[PDB]
Design brief:
Layout (H helix, E strand, L loop, with lengths): L12 E5 L4 E11 L4 E3 L29 H4 L3 E4 L10 E4 L3 E3 L2 H11 L3
Antiparallel strand pairs: 1-2, 1-6, 2-3, 2-4, 4-5
Amino acid sequence: MVDLEQEFALGGRCLAFHGPLMYEAKILKIWDPSSKMYTSIPNDKPGGSSQATKEIKPQKLGEDESIPEEIINGKCFFIHYQGWKSSWDEWVGYDRIRAYNEENIAMKKRLANLE
């Protein structure tokens, strides 16, 4: 068991499950249904864009992304799916993602054995 690192973190790594496998994630633009708008920081960059500008004010969205109602109802994270094209800079909900930790790496290494 661990603490703090297992929570989603602003610019933590993450893991987002598909079913056949999971693919590694990197949280950047984070979303909260309390306003149904998003937030970001330029600590790094998506990959499909050069940065994440500043402490992004929560603003009406739809510039290059959409959260479906499926994920909206919780914390969502626009993540860089690593090992894949930056075209996969996409949000997921907690329904599929968790932050970087050894338990999710135990899931990663068990899964990668099946690849």
